[PDB]
């Protein structure tokens, strides 16, 4: 007869800059995409791994990060939808959360992309293990 509601704050984001010189393959942008916690918080306490599903046109498109930083750097020629799966150190439903991230690129002659997307997860009545893992962040 008592309730719990844990709330964690995640930050998804990405930067994208037009290359001074495009690569031999025609890639014209350097971009990086990241998942992190605010103000250098340590989300590893409850995040097992983070999976970046790149477009099929990329070699080894399913990138995995088991340790911080949860980022992917790459060079490319067009934007796309990047599914990001965040897996928690949870043994109960739900193990991970999915985010469809709009990784867009701006044209040359425009200021580079520095995009931020704040997300906020609320877990209700979790297990005590997951609870203390979540609350150590």
């Amino acid at each position: 007869a008592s309730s719990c509601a844990v709330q964690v704050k995640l930050e998804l984001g990405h930067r994208a800059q037009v290359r001074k010189k495009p690569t031999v393959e025609g890639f014209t942008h350097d971009w990086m995409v990241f998942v992190r916690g605010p103000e250098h918080s340590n989300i590893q306490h409850f995040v097992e791994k983070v999976v970046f599903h790149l477009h099929e046109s990329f070699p080894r498109p399913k990138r995995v990060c088991k340790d911080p930083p949860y980022k992917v750097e790459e060079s490319g020629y067009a934007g796309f939808i990047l599914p990001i799966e965040v897996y928690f150190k949870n043994k109960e439903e739900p193990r991970k959360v999915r985010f469809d991230y709009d990784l867009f690129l701006h044209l040359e002659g425009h200021p580079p992309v520095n995009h931020l997307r704040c997300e906020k997860l609320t877990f209700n009545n979790p297990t005590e293990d997951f609870r203390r893992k979540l609350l150590k962040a």
Binding site: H29, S57, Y77, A78, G79, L105, H106, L107
Partner: peptide, 4 residues
């Protein structure tokens, strides 16, 4: 840029 263009969407892929």
């Amino acid at each position: 840029t263009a969407x892929x």
